[PDB]
Design a protein around this ligand. Structure first.
Ligand code: DAR
Ligand code: CA
Ligand code: CA
Ligand code: CA
Ligand code: CA
Ligand code: ZN
Length: 316
């Protein structure tokens, strides 16, 4: 909407206070004009119609329970925008400052969040498996990274290309979590998963097998569930990315870590310059090797570590 840029204050899903960029015109709207062509957050009102209504508030204070998922969807979209702009010189998901739109309170008891090809969508969870999913910065950034993928490599959401698509979202969701630097880790969804269970998460990148996901190509899922295992076989690539950054020995293969920032540079270049809609895991390895070669040189430790990491997870 047309108005003037303002700064509200609210509390997120985990009870933390934060300032949010709003717009005033009669009401205060969750419309952040400071980033690209705007970040806009909507109320889906427990329905499945999208996007719902642009979030309007009478006083620019967002401390009600019902407000919390909107505060976090809006704020964490801003953090994710900042990460891509400041770290990768990418202006929003399309590289041209496309407006970022998110809807919260999607459906009833909905245990998921997703990018739908046009916008972000967040359920509130059922209160047992999940609390409102926008409370997880890694979840928000995972979603939005799907938008980046859609506009770049275009990885089809099935089989190996879909598992790469998912892993790319987990990698950058984690790197955004480190960027914000609030309790960062290599787990996915720990801030919103199972409020009644401490210390767990939806997935682990450092040890995917802790939740039954494969950590070696020989253990890949080959059936048809989950679009051919896109959230299962992602563990193989997540493990490789974790090893590139942090190092380790895995199935008797040693990997010298090169750190998160270089992981991000290598995978961002692979995603935006080398991957295609049907890339498989072997092609991802080649893309990462080439990206590291472009950035650091063919004889570099970075190239050697990328090769080590894919060797460790059985991808040639
Ligand atoms: N038990 C647990 N914490 N996670 C299981 C599911 C992990 C991954 N396949 C998925 O996200 O579907
Ligand atoms: Ca209010
Ligand atoms: Ca964390
Ligand atoms: Ca995490
Ligand atoms: Ca939990
Ligand atoms: Zn995803």
């Amino acid at each position: 909407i047309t108005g003037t840029s303002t700064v509200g204050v609210g509390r997120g899903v985990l009870g933390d206070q934060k300032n949010i960029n709003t717009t005033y015109s009669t009401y205060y709207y969750l419309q952040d004009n400071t980033r690209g062509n705007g970040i806009f957050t909507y109320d889906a009102k427990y329905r499945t119609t999208l996007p719902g209504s642009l979030w309007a508030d009478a006083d620019n204070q967002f401390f009600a329970s019902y407000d919390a998922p909107a505060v976090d969807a809006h704020y964490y979209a801003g953090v994710t925008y900042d990460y891509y702009k400041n770290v990768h010189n990418r202006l929003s998901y399309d590289g041209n400052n496309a407006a970022i739109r998110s809807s919260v309170h999607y459906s009833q008891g909905y245990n998921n969040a997703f990018w739908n090809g046009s916008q972000m969508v967040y359920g509130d969870g059922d209160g047992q498996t999940f609390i409102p999913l926008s409370g997880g910065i890694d979840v928000v950034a995972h979603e939005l990274t799907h938008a980046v993928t859609d506009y770049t490599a275009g990885l089809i959401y099935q089989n190996e290309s879909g598992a790469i698509n998912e892993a790319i979202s987990d990698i950058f969701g984690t790197l955004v979590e480190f960027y914000a630097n609030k309790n960062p880790d290599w787990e996915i969804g720990e801030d919103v998963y199972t409020p009644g269970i401490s210390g767990d998460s939806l997935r682990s990148m450092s040890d995917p097998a802790k939740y039954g996901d494969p950590d070696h190509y020989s253990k890949r899922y080959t059936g048809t569930q989950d679009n051919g295992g896109v959230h299962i076989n992602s563990g193989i690539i997540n493990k490789a990315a974790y090893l590139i950054s942090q190092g380790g020995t895995h199935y008797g293969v040693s990997v010298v870590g090169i750190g998160r920032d270089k992981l991000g540079k290598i995978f961002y270049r692979a995603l935006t310059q080398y991957l295609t809609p049907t890339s498989n895991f072997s092609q991802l390895r080649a893309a990462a090797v080439q990206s590291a070669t472009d950035l650091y040189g063919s004889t570099s430790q970075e190239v050697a570590s990328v090769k080590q990491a894919f060797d460790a997870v059985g991808v040639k």
